[PDB]
Amino acid sequence: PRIDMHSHFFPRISEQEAAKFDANHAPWLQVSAKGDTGSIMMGKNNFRPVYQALWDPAFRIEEMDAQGVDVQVTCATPVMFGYTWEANKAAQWAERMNDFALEFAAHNPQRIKVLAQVPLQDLDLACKEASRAVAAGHLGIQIGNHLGDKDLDDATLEAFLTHCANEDIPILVHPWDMMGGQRMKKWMLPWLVAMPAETQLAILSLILSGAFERIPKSLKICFGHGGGSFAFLLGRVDNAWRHRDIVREDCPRPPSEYVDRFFVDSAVFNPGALELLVSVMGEDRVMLGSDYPFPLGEQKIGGLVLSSNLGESAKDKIISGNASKFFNIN
Amino acid sequence: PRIDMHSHFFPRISEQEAAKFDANHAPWLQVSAKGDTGSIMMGKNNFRPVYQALWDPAFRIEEMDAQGVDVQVTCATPVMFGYTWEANKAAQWAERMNDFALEFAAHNPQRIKVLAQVPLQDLDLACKEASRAVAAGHLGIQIGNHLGDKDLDDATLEAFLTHCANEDIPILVHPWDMMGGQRMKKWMLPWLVAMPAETQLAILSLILSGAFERIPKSLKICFGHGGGSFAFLLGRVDNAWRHRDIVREDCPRPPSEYVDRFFVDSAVFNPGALELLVSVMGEDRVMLGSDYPFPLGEQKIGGLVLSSNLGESAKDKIISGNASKFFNIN
Ligand SMILES: [Zn+2]
Ligand SMILES: [Zn+2]
């Protein structure tokens, strides 16, 4: 079997639906005149354009059939997160979005699994929604990797992860709200430079802060896009830890020894990069994920893993066995 | 023989010397009471602490002897760059610093080679200083990777590279003035996350802008710290180029085919990372560099390359043959 655990959806939100939350900043879906194409919209401005797989579960199942994908795990498009909104409205939005998600999966719940969003700007509302959404059928949570200047080392975010650990709630960490300022204006550089750095920063924030010494081993947490540049730059981190006490202040063993505390997806778009990723993380900690249905995703889902020279046993773990245990999928 | 082409020096600048340029922002060297240790100072504030190899060429030669380093190429500590200063004062500073550099190397010019800094905020003064410093004995230029929000795709920086290409002046691009804002305050995260992303951004800015279609092939340009995360994230860039026209707008062939237009040093602190780097760049485009004498450099210079499983022929190119041709060292 084949599980793709990194994909996105966007719900059929109407303009008036979104305006009952925020006419200016709540996103909504316009399935335009040709109907094949949408804008995610913000207010009446256009946000970015999308196509039908994002919103149509029937159309998506036929593509999954064609790709040979048996089970796809899907979650919010990050524009849905609403982390800057007033907390109570953000909690109402998260519940609505997560209900939308379960309705998406209800067309074929054996083949479409969903993860939930949470109002991460209020720790109490976010823990309550994580528990509520998983009890209603979600298999885990997808969060952005940072909340403004608060990275994953911040006690509020560590506490959210620890809540999920203690309740057996898996987490997918997705880069969002990219660093860079007024640079990287062209050629989608935020997706090529800032996004892998954001994910590396999230992983290193947990490691170098000592958070894994405090978060229970029960935490199942995965980072998108192969963990960004984390695995390649890990030697540089270990060398810094060895030679500067301020890099060691909160992290009692070499940073690379914490790779047994998290997972990555396999979306690194290159055979050598995947071999290095599996070398660093272990065949038990890399899961097939495509970023379907976005253009910077993998067109032939699983093609990189399937055409690799990894062991047949490792190929099965990455394509199916790891996600099956991580998300409890049969 | 062994050439280390990535290292730094800082000159014996006195507080009054620096104040004749800028009492607040010109850096200077305080060889403190125990004399083993300095602060680079800024005004009367402390900038950061350094040790004697940075400023003492005699002491440095004995360490090079112990390490088995025959020739070391050395250049300004980036705090010396002065890219935010008024241009004419910055040009006076660059000339003074580059004279300081040649005095450093004059104790043993066969074993200590220097690269120059330039007042990059004025293209004309920067080209004139590049030519002047190379004519006086410098083997090339070291620049920061960006000038504020101007990355290497900016016409002014492309024109500086093209000047150097046309005059057979090699360039080392070093990350500096790191992105990140108010994040990455702890555990030297700017050096672990922001620095490799800065260097990747510089390389991708040249590639995706089409600059290599305009800059002559004669350009010899090397990027520090293995090119940052560039080689690992290259598959993701090629995939984006294939699937979004705005990533292709200015770059007429797959981004990965431009690796024959630049070099990287070998400082990636991990055997698998070095194997991937050589796979991507080619054994002819990776040069031994240590980041001596800084703590996030390589303590045993050349140890990673020498203990690798690369061919004996590839080991010689990386340790000596490539830098010898790149910088014209005998
Ligand atoms: Zn995604
Ligand atoms: Zn350096």
Task: Characterize the structure shown.
The structure is a homodimer of 330-residue chains. With 330 residues, chain A is an alpha/beta fold. Chain A has one domain (1-330). In chain A, 40% of the residues lie in helices and 14% in strands. Chain A contains twelve helices and twelve strands. Chain A has helices spanning 15-22, 57-67, 87-105, 123-135, 155-166, 189-208, 211-214, 234-243, 245-248, 271-281, 303-306, 312-327; strands at residues 3-4, 8-9, 27-31, 37-42, 45-51, 71-76, 112-114, 141-144, 171-174, 221-223, 263-265, 286-287. In chain A, the strands form three sheets. The first copy, chain A, has a five-stranded parallel sheet.
Secondary-structure blueprint:
2 copies of one chain form a homodimer.
Chain A: E1 3-4, E2 8-9, H1 15-22, E3 27-31, E4 37-42, E5 45-51, H2 57-67, E6 71-76, H3 87-105, E7 112-114, H4 123-135, E8 141-144, H5 155-166, E9 171-174, H6 189-208, H7 211-214, E10 221-223, H8 234-243, H9 245-248, E11 263-265, H10 271-281, E12 286-287, H11 303-306, H12 312-327
Parallel strand pairs in A: 1-6, 2-6, 6-7, 8-9, 9-10, 10-11, 11-12
Antiparallel strand pairs in A: 3-4, 4-5
The portion of residues assigned to helices of chain A is 40-55%
**H/E topology pattern of chain A:** EEHEEEHEHEHEHEHHEHHEHEHH
Biggest β-sheet: strands ordered side by side in the sheet of chain A: 8-9-10-11-12
Number of domains of chain A: 1
How would a crystallographer describe the biggest sheet of chain A?
Answer: 5 strands, parallel
Strand content of chain A: 5-15%
The helix/strand class of chain A is alpha/beta
Distance between the termini of chain A: 10 Å
